Design an enzyme around this catalytic site. Structure first.
Site, PDB file in Angstrom:
ATOM      1  N   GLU C 232       0.822  -1.206   0.000  1.00 25.23           N
ATOM      2  CA  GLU C 232       0.000   0.000   0.000  1.00 25.23           C
ATOM      3  C   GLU C 232       0.861   1.262   0.000  1.00 25.23           C
ATOM      4  N   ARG C 258      -3.739  33.745 -16.817  1.00 27.52           N
ATOM      5  CA  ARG C 258      -4.336  34.727 -15.925  1.00 27.52           C
ATOM      6  C   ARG C 258      -3.496  35.989 -15.906  1.00 27.52           C
ATOM      7  N   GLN C 269       7.779  36.402  -9.894  1.00 31.59           N
ATOM      8  CA  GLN C 269       8.536  35.278  -9.367  1.00 31.59           C
ATOM      9  C   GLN C 269       7.898  34.669  -8.121  1.00 31.59           C
TER      10      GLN C 269
HETATM   11  C1  LIG Z   1     -13.193  33.760   1.175  1.00 29.71           C
HETATM   12  C2  LIG Z   1     -12.962  34.932   0.261  1.00 29.71           C
HETATM   13  C3  LIG Z   1     -13.725  36.082   0.424  1.00 29.71           C
HETATM   14  C4  LIG Z   1     -13.537  37.191  -0.403  1.00 29.71           C
HETATM   15  N1  LIG Z   1     -14.324  38.310  -0.195  1.00 29.71           N
HETATM   16  C5  LIG Z   1     -14.146  39.339  -0.977  1.00 29.71           C
HETATM   17  C6  LIG Z   1     -14.986  40.510  -0.763  1.00 29.71           C
HETATM   18  O1  LIG Z   1     -15.857  40.626   0.102  1.00 29.71           O
HETATM   19  N2  LIG Z   1     -14.745  41.537  -1.652  1.00 29.71           N
HETATM   20  C7  LIG Z   1     -13.802  41.529  -2.666  1.00 29.71           C
HETATM   21  O2  LIG Z   1     -13.688  42.532  -3.376  1.00 29.71           O
HETATM   22  N3  LIG Z   1     -13.023  40.425  -2.863  1.00 29.71           N
HETATM   23  C8  LIG Z   1     -13.192  39.387  -2.053  1.00 29.71           C
HETATM   24  N4  LIG Z   1     -12.438  38.243  -2.274  1.00 29.71           N
HETATM   25  C9  LIG Z   1     -11.340  38.300  -3.260  1.00 29.71           C
HETATM   26  C10 LIG Z   1     -10.078  38.867  -2.584  1.00 29.71           C
HETATM   27  O3  LIG Z   1     -10.119  40.279  -2.392  1.00 29.71           O
HETATM   28  C11 LIG Z   1      -8.780  38.461  -3.286  1.00 29.71           C
HETATM   29  O4  LIG Z   1      -7.888  39.564  -3.412  1.00 29.71           O
HETATM   30  C12 LIG Z   1      -8.781  37.857  -4.666  1.00 29.71           C
HETATM   31  O5  LIG Z   1      -9.380  36.569  -4.572  1.00 29.71           O
HETATM   32  C13 LIG Z   1      -7.320  37.770  -5.043  1.00 29.71           C
HETATM   33  O6  LIG Z   1      -7.191  38.003  -6.455  1.00 29.71           O
HETATM   34  P1  LIG Z   1      -7.563  36.885  -7.490  1.00 29.71           P
HETATM   35  O7  LIG Z   1      -8.417  35.806  -6.818  1.00 29.71           O
HETATM   36  O8  LIG Z   1      -8.138  37.467  -8.737  1.00 29.71           O
HETATM   37  O9  LIG Z   1      -6.170  36.232  -7.791  1.00 29.71           O
HETATM   38  P2  LIG Z   1      -5.051  36.909  -8.680  1.00 29.71           P
HETATM   39  O10 LIG Z   1      -4.925  38.340  -8.310  1.00 29.71           O
HETATM   40  O11 LIG Z   1      -5.307  36.504 -10.136  1.00 29.71           O
HETATM   41  O12 LIG Z   1      -3.771  36.213  -8.199  1.00 29.71           O
HETATM   42  C14 LIG Z   1      -3.424  34.881  -8.635  1.00 29.71           C
HETATM   43  C15 LIG Z   1      -2.027  34.589  -8.143  1.00 29.71           C
HETATM   44  O13 LIG Z   1      -1.108  35.596  -8.652  1.00 29.71           O
HETATM   45  C16 LIG Z   1      -0.450  36.203  -7.561  1.00 29.71           C
HETATM   46  N5  LIG Z   1      -0.126  37.587  -7.870  1.00 29.71           N
HETATM   47  C17 LIG Z   1      -0.958  38.549  -8.377  1.00 29.71           C
HETATM   48  N6  LIG Z   1      -0.399  39.732  -8.482  1.00 29.71           N
HETATM   49  C18 LIG Z   1       0.886  39.537  -7.991  1.00 29.71           C
HETATM   50  C19 LIG Z   1       1.988  40.404  -7.823  1.00 29.71           C
HETATM   51  N7  LIG Z   1       1.980  41.701  -8.162  1.00 29.71           N
HETATM   52  N8  LIG Z   1       3.126  39.879  -7.307  1.00 29.71           N
HETATM   53  C20 LIG Z   1       3.148  38.586  -6.979  1.00 29.71           C
HETATM   54  N9  LIG Z   1       2.178  37.679  -7.093  1.00 29.71           N
HETATM   55  C21 LIG Z   1       1.065  38.221  -7.603  1.00 29.71           C
HETATM   56  C22 LIG Z   1      -1.419  36.066  -6.392  1.00 29.71           C
HETATM   57  O14 LIG Z   1      -0.813  36.333  -5.135  1.00 29.71           O
HETATM   58  C23 LIG Z   1      -1.880  34.627  -6.621  1.00 29.71           C
HETATM   59  O15 LIG Z   1      -0.908  33.682  -6.184  1.00 29.71           O
HETATM   60  C24 LIG Z   1     -12.562  37.136  -1.413  1.00 29.71           C
HETATM   61  C25 LIG Z   1     -11.805  35.984  -1.584  1.00 29.71           C
HETATM   62  C26 LIG Z   1     -12.000  34.880  -0.760  1.00 29.71           C
HETATM   63  C27 LIG Z   1     -11.157  33.656  -0.967  1.00 29.71           C
HETATM   64  C1  LIG Z   2      32.935  29.823  -4.495  1.00 34.38           C
HETATM   65  C2  LIG Z   2      32.600  30.567  -5.760  1.00 34.38           C
HETATM   66  C3  LIG Z   2      33.315  30.293  -6.919  1.00 34.38           C
HETATM   67  C4  LIG Z   2      33.030  30.960  -8.111  1.00 34.38           C
HETATM   68  N1  LIG Z   2      33.773  30.647  -9.236  1.00 34.38           N
HETATM   69  C5  LIG Z   2      33.505  31.281 -10.344  1.00 34.38           C
HETATM   70  C6  LIG Z   2      34.298  30.958 -11.523  1.00 34.38           C
HETATM   71  O1  LIG Z   2      35.208  30.128 -11.575  1.00 34.38           O
HETATM   72  N2  LIG Z   2      33.961  31.695 -12.639  1.00 34.38           N
HETATM   73  C7  LIG Z   2      32.967  32.655 -12.709  1.00 34.38           C
HETATM   74  O2  LIG Z   2      32.767  33.224 -13.786  1.00 34.38           O
HETATM   75  N3  LIG Z   2      32.231  32.956 -11.598  1.00 34.38           N
HETATM   76  C8  LIG Z   2      32.493  32.296 -10.477  1.00 34.38           C
HETATM   77  N4  LIG Z   2      31.783  32.627  -9.330  1.00 34.38           N
HETATM   78  C9  LIG Z   2      30.632  33.543  -9.452  1.00 34.38           C
HETATM   79  C10 LIG Z   2      29.382  32.740  -9.861  1.00 34.38           C
HETATM   80  O3  LIG Z   2      29.367  32.371 -11.237  1.00 34.38           O
HETATM   81  C11 LIG Z   2      28.070  33.427  -9.477  1.00 34.38           C
HETATM   82  O4  LIG Z   2      27.121  33.367 -10.537  1.00 34.38           O
HETATM   83  C12 LIG Z   2      28.025  34.872  -9.053  1.00 34.38           C
HETATM   84  O5  LIG Z   2      28.688  34.973  -7.797  1.00 34.38           O
HETATM   85  C13 LIG Z   2      26.551  35.187  -8.936  1.00 34.38           C
HETATM   86  O6  LIG Z   2      26.336  36.549  -9.338  1.00 34.38           O
HETATM   87  P1  LIG Z   2      26.704  37.736  -8.381  1.00 34.38           P
HETATM   88  O7  LIG Z   2      27.643  37.250  -7.274  1.00 34.38           O
HETATM   89  O8  LIG Z   2      27.182  38.924  -9.146  1.00 34.38           O
HETATM   90  O9  LIG Z   2      25.328  38.052  -7.698  1.00 34.38           O
HETATM   91  P2  LIG Z   2      24.133  38.792  -8.420  1.00 34.38           P
HETATM   92  O10 LIG Z   2      23.960  38.236  -9.784  1.00 34.38           O
HETATM   93  O11 LIG Z   2      24.329  40.299  -8.216  1.00 34.38           O
HETATM   94  O12 LIG Z   2      22.915  38.345  -7.601  1.00 34.38           O
HETATM   95  C14 LIG Z   2      22.609  38.933  -6.318  1.00 34.38           C
HETATM   96  C15 LIG Z   2      21.256  38.416  -5.891  1.00 34.38           C
HETATM   97  O13 LIG Z   2      20.264  38.748  -6.903  1.00 34.38           O
HETATM   98  C16 LIG Z   2      19.638  37.557  -7.331  1.00 34.38           C
HETATM   99  N5  LIG Z   2      19.232  37.670  -8.724  1.00 34.38           N
HETATM  100  C17 LIG Z   2      19.989  38.087  -9.785  1.00 34.38           C
HETATM  101  N6  LIG Z   2      19.369  38.012 -10.940  1.00 34.38           N
HETATM  102  C18 LIG Z   2      18.123  37.489 -10.616  1.00 34.38           C
HETATM  103  C19 LIG Z   2      16.992  37.160 -11.394  1.00 34.38           C
HETATM  104  N7  LIG Z   2      16.920  37.328 -12.721  1.00 34.38           N
HETATM  105  N8  LIG Z   2      15.910  36.662 -10.747  1.00 34.38           N
HETATM  106  C20 LIG Z   2      15.967  36.503  -9.424  1.00 34.38           C
HETATM  107  N9  LIG Z   2      16.972  36.778  -8.592  1.00 34.38           N
HETATM  108  C21 LIG Z   2      18.029  37.267  -9.253  1.00 34.38           C
HETATM  109  C22 LIG Z   2      20.673  36.463  -7.100  1.00 34.38           C
HETATM  110  O14 LIG Z   2      20.124  35.155  -7.173  1.00 34.38           O
HETATM  111  C23 LIG Z   2      21.190  36.897  -5.729  1.00 34.38           C
HETATM  112  O15 LIG Z   2      20.289  36.540  -4.685  1.00 34.38           O
HETATM  113  C24 LIG Z   2      32.006  31.922  -8.132  1.00 34.38           C
HETATM  114  C25 LIG Z   2      31.296  32.204  -6.971  1.00 34.38           C
HETATM  115  C26 LIG Z   2      31.587  31.539  -5.784  1.00 34.38           C
HETATM  116  C27 LIG Z   2      30.793  31.862  -4.553  1.00 34.38           C
HETATM  117  C1  LIG Z   3       6.016  -0.116  14.791  1.00 33.30           C
HETATM  118  C2  LIG Z   3       5.434  -0.168  13.371  1.00 33.30           C
HETATM  119  C3  LIG Z   3       6.229   0.809  12.487  1.00 33.30           C
HETATM  120  C4  LIG Z   3       5.467  -1.609  12.855  1.00 33.30           C
HETATM  121  O1  LIG Z   3       6.466  -1.756  11.914  1.00 33.30           O
HETATM  122  P1  LIG Z   3       6.801  -3.265  11.367  1.00 33.30           P
HETATM  123  O2  LIG Z   3       5.596  -4.193  11.382  1.00 33.30           O
HETATM  124  O3  LIG Z   3       7.455  -3.123   9.997  1.00 33.30           O
HETATM  125  O4  LIG Z   3       7.865  -3.884  12.176  1.00 33.30           O
HETATM  126  C5  LIG Z   3       3.925   0.099  13.411  1.00 33.30           C
HETATM  127  O5  LIG Z   3       3.600   0.834  14.560  1.00 33.30           O
HETATM  128  C6  LIG Z   3       3.307   0.676  12.116  1.00 33.30           C
HETATM  129  O6  LIG Z   3       3.696   0.406  11.019  1.00 33.30           O
HETATM  130  N1  LIG Z   3       2.146   1.529  12.228  1.00 33.30           N
HETATM  131  C7  LIG Z   3       1.536   2.056  11.024  1.00 33.30           C
HETATM  132  C8  LIG Z   3       0.010   2.006  11.089  1.00 33.30           C
HETATM  133  C9  LIG Z   3      -0.610   1.774   9.721  1.00 33.30           C
HETATM  134  O7  LIG Z   3       0.172   1.756   8.818  1.00 33.30           O
HETATM  135  N2  LIG Z   3      -2.057   1.575   9.505  1.00 33.30           N
HETATM  136  C10 LIG Z   3      -2.483   1.323   8.120  1.00 33.30           C
HETATM  137  C11 LIG Z   3      -3.943   0.921   7.791  1.00 33.30           C
HETATM  138  S1  LIG Z   3      -4.527   2.320   6.735  1.00 33.30           S
END
Ligand SMILES: Cc1cc2nc3c(=O)[nH]c(=O)nc-3n(C[C@H](O)[C@H](O)[C@H](O)COP(=O)(O)OP(=O)(O)OC[C@H]3O[C@@H](n4cnc5c(N)ncnc54)[C@H](O)[C@@H]3O)c2cc1C
Ligand SMILES: Cc1cc2nc3c(=O)[nH]c(=O)nc-3n(C[C@H](O)[C@H](O)[C@H](O)COP(=O)(O)OP(=O)(O)OC[C@H]3O[C@@H](n4cnc5c(N)ncnc54)[C@H](O)[C@@H]3O)c2cc1C
Ligand SMILES: CC(C)(COP(=O)(O)O)[C@@H](O)C(=O)NCCC(=O)NCCS
Ligand SMILES: Cc1cc2nc3c(=O)[nH]c(=O)nc-3n(C[C@H](O)[C@H](O)[C@H](O)COP(=O)(O)OP(=O)(O)OC[C@H]3O[C@@H](n4cnc5c(N)ncnc54)[C@H](O)[C@@H]3O)c2cc1C
Ligand SMILES: Cc1cc2nc3c(=O)[nH]c(=O)nc-3n(C[C@H](O)[C@H](O)[C@H](O)COP(=O)(O)OP(=O)(O)OC[C@H]3O[C@@H](n4cnc5c(N)ncnc54)[C@H](O)[C@@H]3O)c2cc1C
Ligand SMILES: CC(C)(COP(=O)(O)O)[C@@H](O)C(=O)NCCC(=O)NCCS
Ligand SMILES: CC(C)(COP(=O)(O)O)[C@@H](O)C(=O)NCCC(=O)NCCS
Ligand SMILES: CC(C)(COP(=O)(O)O)[C@@H](O)C(=O)NCCC(=O)NCCS
Lengths: 370, 63, 370, 370, 370, 63, 63, 63
Positions: C232, C258, C269
């Protein structure tokens, strides 16, 4: 710098904890919440004889207590959308007559916030819902796709484009009464969690509403929205801190009672250290919640603390709901277990008020990241 | 104000900031912050509007 | 060392992929799976004219294809409990007459595996279900608390204590026919996911069954159970690798379509790197699945590879179901979204066949950890 | 689909395992590796009498064995840059005379790959290093900022811009001999890990090199680079799978010996389940490594499997190095502990050959994400 | 419930921030810290004319400021062991004469805490170091294996077994002067990080010390130790919150300046959302730090909040050090980068004052888990 | 080939693809893939060069 | 066989291994492994039974 | 006080609690907590000592 609640705050908190067990759409429980004062918590007495005029900390602390003691999280969520996405923008940007008109029933009639569209969710910069002014009236057109409280709403806080050329500033916020001709509402959506908070599509087909229903100046809508999201993201998620404490309490109680091999499962570190991490994330989330509410009362930019709190709380809630099920085994997977509602509701909480991705965008912004 | 070109965009005084999307919800925060450090001005809420933020020239005017 | 499937295996795989869209308890879909050959995959022709006699890799690869193309994961899960927790221990430890009696209908009648009790879940060392021998018969007594296929079962593979003094070796495995007097079954449990796989309490009240229904020697039950869990945990979880590929495919398609801000969300992101990590965990999980099935055909201890695969696959499935919803936003939280079933089923998958904690206990053991 | 190594491969693998204990810049150990055959593994006999002409799987499996038995990971890393970032692009894109000139000593003289610049790291699209052609010669100008093997190099594989207008195709790859006037090299950088692999700044000040030192056609450099990164990202990281196995072996041995409270620490699930997860990630990483090497021998696009493997392996190596220290306590934090070198080297491994972020960009691309 | 620091606290905090740039064993920097008041922060004026008598919050806030502005984290760590593992148990359980004898130089002479042994680390229940009373003197015997400040110590706070039969209560705490015959000290250990905090083996070979050097009643040692760990785990880790803020500040500054493709790397969400999570964990850790210090001033059991804070802070510090390097690329891996010291020091921080595993054991305990 | 405009850019036959950065390392993969599905052509390695990929017109030529 | 005391328990030839829980599912694996390295015997499946594994004496017998 | 047997151990009035390890650092916390809820007594620091915590009888005495 202290973490002491006043005598009065502790008493309101235990009053919220005691209220939990006195509880289609559960209209009776909703009215009971009104009587308790739930929709009136941040409303001043000036606009409702049953408004409490509490500060943000006393508010969220009471809400946290309701989230801990009320099992219907969806119902608390519905009430908090109504109060913080609708009542507050009305309090803060409505004319004096609209405030005296709308708020007394709101503090006690139901309101729904409508901004999301078919093509606008995380991005609310280009709303397809339009409002053309004609004389003393505005004519609204477009669909809103996810309206909490849609089917039960007496008023909609609608955000529409009034001027596509002014972009981020080309949007106005309206209070559209239900009973305005041209409104149709879809059936409650079937969704993963939160059954007690209705979610509906609402269409507006040539809705004519008087100038006096507009919230604030024309073109202010996007910032009125951001201001209501500051209320919803801060105060609504207090519910989920309360729910996590109940979750943790049930996992402690279960792990100390459930036995496997004439040992209680808490003697396994896979269980107990999992519960430890539930308590760490909870205390972290609760503290970030309190910190965000305090800053909001302080006249600084509090968006970073509020986005952080919503993120931390909602993500902890998801982890809390998974872990709660893991701790309870098959019992937690079963519905009678009374445990799998957390994960079902928590997955909503990382979406509404802006997804976790969008909160981080805000956090990045307030940190200075270009 | 090559700030708008480097910090916000990575343009002149007549490029329409609101119409073409350069100032949104996030970029506004960065701009209002720069306006507080460089010029000491803290733009009150009432005056965030499409007149003053039509472009750099109108914006500089209000500063 | 190669990763090439034979021409015949690729063809069976695309046959499983094509079969998916030809689909209370969905008895019609279950029979259609029988006709396809799903319950016959590892059965030899010697015991069923429609048995396939496939090796473990061809088996799991076909199952992986069914998991990718069939949306009813619960139904695949039910069929796999039946085949791998019941049919296989019958093939491997049943008398020759019991094999010819039971298997032809099993390969095509329904079977259910019953070991869990009110006080025995992760620990199956002290089973309260007893089997006293009387003459040529055994008398079974006790409740089994979480029987998949309980309500639809024609046979139960029951594990009972025959000799409390022999401990780990004091347990025997029986095939209890439904229709043995004294069996009562509870209604299907309401549970988080997997609605098509019934889960029931079964009570055995003085069930008298003939000696010939016992599986293997008396006292062998605990090792017969471990041997069925090796089937299972290895083969059933092939379903979830197939389901993750569908999940990933739907997130790629959605993120490329969306749009938010006249850009597709895959350009963020936060979305795209989330989908990248879905593909990394999937390829990891698929590879560990294949590796475990190969070792099982090899005559070495394969428990470590099997526990690893079940762990990796089930935990990836949970992450896959969360991420799938995150990618789809509100659409993924809605039921019509057709997306939130993954998380609901995946949370089952980290419990049955032994929780993630218990797999690690096995892994530790096979690594040498005292 | 099988995971069986041939008799000859197992024998080469145990030969690599046995070789480990026969071991400024450790020139003696480097020569001993040459004698073992380390730089000759993928070189054909046609170009070196001590070339092995092994396929990618036999290559990486031997490298994996060296990574397990040789404690100087930095030395293996240096040798693998030399072989896979330099020897291979020479084998695959050098003229026949340059191949017979350079390779016999390379397979046994030291080579260094130089592409990174002050303003080019993750983005290698706009290289400031230029190569102007003059008659039968190219004139190279610019600094390379992080050259592994810089100070010990006899040849540099340099990537320069030959035509800024052809962009992604405006770059050529050269073999610059050390002893070409105009080369100056900085002192070895002090860095976190990998002390035995020198890292240097190299400046090229009007280096005149004959046409025959260019690798492939002018403008091919960016794709020659991608082809060498396919070798380095696939085969170099075999070292780290070997090192993780040693890490895991030392944590198993330690946890079964170290006692706290007259119990061995492996009896705590915080320790043992941590070691379980080391073994799961290792088997995952090893399997993804093997899978990527097999696909590379298969004539399909293997970039997705190679990026996945580098990601999985390098990130597992970081986790492995943290966990190794956690398991050993203070002993692992001390240098004599002989344990903290993993984390120090592993943090390099998530940077070079392209950071973890950049691998995911590749993965996204190959998945279809726009 | 507020998060406001008094005018005086803000001023002390900016005084700590300004002090950072005024800075074998760096004795000069250590004396400069004494002059600033670092070892005097929690000492009352009654026992040192340069004692500050600050409450725990003002203390940790100043320490947090020193951790942010002083690059030598190891030096701050040394000074904090001295003050919180040694000075505080002397203040809280020393005779009045020993307090007036020892504290004036301690607040300004160096002290070292010695409990760990070859076979006692996480478990300090069975210490092999013995103290037999003879007349008016105690005779100490045994080795201590990891003494911070060992080589520079003028006094050791030694924990020894006085009565093996009283177990958890059979241990006494002593102040052993350096210059007590029979003390030998090993050379400073070479270790991963924290070079400025010496770590030594100390052996005690028939050390005869007068009754008046004992801390508290005989048999109190284990609880005196727990009380000093409450100081060290709460206040020492303030350093690491300060260091994380510097880390975050350098990642914000770097991500807004470093360009790849004429875009700054902060425009990639893989970078920016990584930095967001650094800020979330930091605010979480800082808030849990403040909360633990407040509870400690409040007369309740504060062990759960202190264990949580040490856990959250130390684990965030490890993540902070990895992420800091990831953000900076190769520059962060190089020593001149001035960045890789965080991960090197942070890995110490999840070990001393009790490993992360042991903090969770405490947390579980205080939560009620059996 | 509005594919380049939607899929790769989200332009005409004379826009310089290499010079202005439209085809890089990643976009090339998407393009070569589209060239295999839509037109059945699998561009060999030797002919990836700045002549043929100068622009859409030269590219279409080689297809 | 002080192996059972150190490795499995951290006792004599008459202590009942099965009855008191010393050999279970996990400990059996460790024991069968030790029986293969120290004594070269690989106990077949058929002979894992309560007779032979009653205690150390009966177990040693079967080895 | 079968609390010590169930909660802390999962024994009589003369079993030596300290000598055999039943009360340590963690179990003490659970015990002191139980002593506060069941009997209302909050044992001061000075009186945690091997006399009073020698066993259940001596412990009950101090309560
Ligand atoms: C139980 C419940 C009650 C509600 N009641 C009300 C109410 O009374 N009145 C009302 O007006 N609304 C209401 N809503 C809606 C609410 O206001 C939410 O804001 C809405 O559901 C969120 O937008 P969306 O569902 O269109 O999702 P989207 O905005 O489409 O988002 C979808 C996804 O994209 C992400 N996302 C969007 N924009 C960004 C951004 N800039 N950066 C990063 N991620 C982003 C979101 O976080 C999510 O993960 C309710 C919702 C629920 C679940
Ligand atoms: C031990 C070690 C050995 C290395 N050896 C080499 C080598 O031999 N040759 C070489 O060329 N380089 C080498 N580097 C550098 C390596 O290639 C890394 O890519 C570099 O350090 C990362 O870029 P940065 O340090 O300029 O940081 P940045 O690029 O400035 O990033 C800073 C922050 O911003 C974030 N970020 C950047 N762009 C984005 C994006 N588009 N979306 C989301 N987040 C983002 C990063 O993830 C991080 O959190 C080495 C680094 C280390 C630590
Ligand atoms: C101690 C033990 C791990 C027994 O392991 P064993 O028989 O491999 O020696 C036991 O307590 C256990 O497996 N419990 C799990 C309960 C369970 O799996 N229920 C399933 C029915 S949905
Ligand atoms: C969808 C579904 C279908 C099922 N179908 C069947 C079926 O057909 N037949 C059947 O017999 N059972 C079935 N079960 C039950 C299944 O076999 C599980 O093993 C059982 O649910 C797990 O034990 P438990 O629920 O009693 O939890 P427990 O064993 O009480 O475990 C509770 C918690 O303690 C942990 N824990 C327990 N022991 C240890 C340990 N030694 N070390 C560390 N942590 C430990 C667990 O991992 C878990 O976190 C099914 C369960 C589900 C969810
Ligand atoms: C930089 C540094 C400075 C130090 N300075 C001092 C000092 O001044 N004075 C001093 O006395 N000591 C000092 N130490 C030691 C310190 O107090 C640590 O507690 C000690 O190193 C941890 O125990 P150990 O090293 O023996 O590891 P062990 O206790 O052997 O632990 C090894 C592993 O087993 C785990 N483990 C142990 N018990 C349990 C359990 N019950 N449950 C779960 N997992 C468990 C650990 O968490 C760890 O993963 C220092 C250590 C370092 C790194
Ligand atoms: C860009 C931005 C962050 C706007 O931020 P801003 O108005 O503070 O400037 C915006 O896209 C946003 O907040 N989206 C969140 C969507 C949302 O919260 N919907 C809530 C109704 S439940
Ligand atoms: C965009 C791209 C992914 C190029 O990919 P491509 O040439 O496969 O098309 C490129 O930016 C890249 O691979 N950067 C990695 C940098 C690197 O690997 N340096 C290694 C020397 S240690
Ligand atoms: C069991 C226990 C948790 C003791 O806790 P307690 O004294 O609070 O009751 C103990 O094992 C412990 O705290 N170990 C930690 C070791 C340590 O902190 N060494 C610090 C010197 S750097």
């Amino acid at each position: 710098m202290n973490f002491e609640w006043t005598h009065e705050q502790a008493e309101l908190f235990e009053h919220a904890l005691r209220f939990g067990k006195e509880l289609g759409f559960p209209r009776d429980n909703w009215n009971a919440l009104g009587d308790f004062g739930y929709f009136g918590l941040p409303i001043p007495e000036k606009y409702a004889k049953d408004g409490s005029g509490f500060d943000i900390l006393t508010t969220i602390k009471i809400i946290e207590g309701l989230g801990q003691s009320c099992t219907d999280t969806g119902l608390l969520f519905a009430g908090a959308a109504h109060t913080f996405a609708c009542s507050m923008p009305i309090l803060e940007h409505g004319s004096e007559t609209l405030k005296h008109q709308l708020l007394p029933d709101l503090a006690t009639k139901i309101a729904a916030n409508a901004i999301s569209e078919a093509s606008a969710g995380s991005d609310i910069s280009n709303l397809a819902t339009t409002a053309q002014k004609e004389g003393d009236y505005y004519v609204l057109n477009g669909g809103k796709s996810y309206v909490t409280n849609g089917s039960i709403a007496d008023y909609y806080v609608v955000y529409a484009t009034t001027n596509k050329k002014h972009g981020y500033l080309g949007q106005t916020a309206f209070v559209v009464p239900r009973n305005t001709p041209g409104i149709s509402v879809g059936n409650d959506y079937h969704k993963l969690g939160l059954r007690s908070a209705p979610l509906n599509q609402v269409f507006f087909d040539n809705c004519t509403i008087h100038k006096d229903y507009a919230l604030g100046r024309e073109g202010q809508g996007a910032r009125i929205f951001a201001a209501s999201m500051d209320w919803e993201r801060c105060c609504l998620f207090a519910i989920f801190v309360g729910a996590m404490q109940r979750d943790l309490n049930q996992c402690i109680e279960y792990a100390n009672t459930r036995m496997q091999g004439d040992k209680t499962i808490s003697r396994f570190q896979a269980v107990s250290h999992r519960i430890a991490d539930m308590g760490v994330r909870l205390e972290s989330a609760r503290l970030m919640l309190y910190y965000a509410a305090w800053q909001k009362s302080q006249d600084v930019d509090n968006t970073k603390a509020v986005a952080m709190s919503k993120l931390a709380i909602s993500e902890a809630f998801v982890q809390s709901g998974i872990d709660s099920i893991r701790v309870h085994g098959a019992l937690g997977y079963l519905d009678e277990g009374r445990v799998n509602n957390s994960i079902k509701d928590a997955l909503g909480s990382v979406l509404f008020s802006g997804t976790s991705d969008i909160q981080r965008e805000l956090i990045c912004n307030r940190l200075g990241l270009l | 104000i090559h700030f708008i070109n480097n910090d916000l965009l990575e343009l002149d005084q007549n490029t329409p900031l609101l119409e073409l999307g350069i100032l949104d919800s996030l970029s506004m925060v960065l701009l209002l912050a720069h306006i507080d450090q460089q010029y000491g001005v803290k733009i009150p809420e009432h005056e965030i509007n499409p007149e003053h933020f039509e472009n750099v020239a109108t914006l500089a005017a209000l500063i």
